[PDB]
Design a binder for this molecule. Structure first.
Ligand SMILES: COc1ccncc1CC(=O)N1C[C@@H](C(N)=O)C[C@@H]2CCCC[C@H]21
Ligand SMILES: [Zn+2]
Length: 139
């Protein structure tokens, strides 16, 4: 679990969005596993606007932060699951690191701010849904 709170927006993994997120829907994209809902309170987070390929992410299954080198956002194949058919997930960044399904929502940060959230992984890999291209989150 986890979310980004920026301005009057809440960014979550689309597969973990609650009934309240869908009732306050701003935007969603199944191909990116992202959903953004509106909030009444002002958020605590800053979004990175950069091309960093290193950063640190929070891993709830280890209660620890880990440093990572990750690939640029791209289209990556993800197997079918209970929430999605087998498909290419877009705007995904991979790195070598530990992750389990419940780690989705952990934040990846660089020196500039929030880069994305954990969305996929397996076998010593961790994948992050990028949010740096969503310029409208800042306004
Ligand atoms: C952090 O996730 C890990 C990590 C390790 N092994 C597995 C996973 C879990 C994983 O990759 N997926 C794919 C995800 C997606 N973006 O399509 C969402 C799915 C929700 C239902 C369980 C399967 C999940
Ligand atoms: Zn950066």
């Amino acid at each position: 679990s986890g979310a980004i709170y920026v301005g009057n927006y809440r960014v979550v993994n689309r597969h973990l969005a609650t009934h309240n997120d869908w009732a306050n829907l701003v935007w969603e994209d199944s191909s990116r596993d992202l959903l953004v809902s509106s909030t009444t309170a002002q958020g605590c987070d800053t979004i990175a606007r950069c091309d960093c390929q290193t950063g640190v992410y929070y891993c709830s299954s280890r209660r620890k932060h880990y440093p990572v080198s990750f690939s640029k956002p791209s289209l990556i194949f993800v197997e079918a699951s209970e929430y999605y058919p087998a498909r290419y997930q877009s705007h995904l960044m991979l790195a070598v690191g530990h992750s389990e399904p419940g780690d989705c929502g952990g934040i990846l940060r660089c020196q500039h701010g929030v880069v994305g959230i954990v969305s996929t992984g397996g076998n010593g890999l961790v994948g992050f849904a990028d949010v740096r291209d969503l310029l409208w989150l800042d306004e």
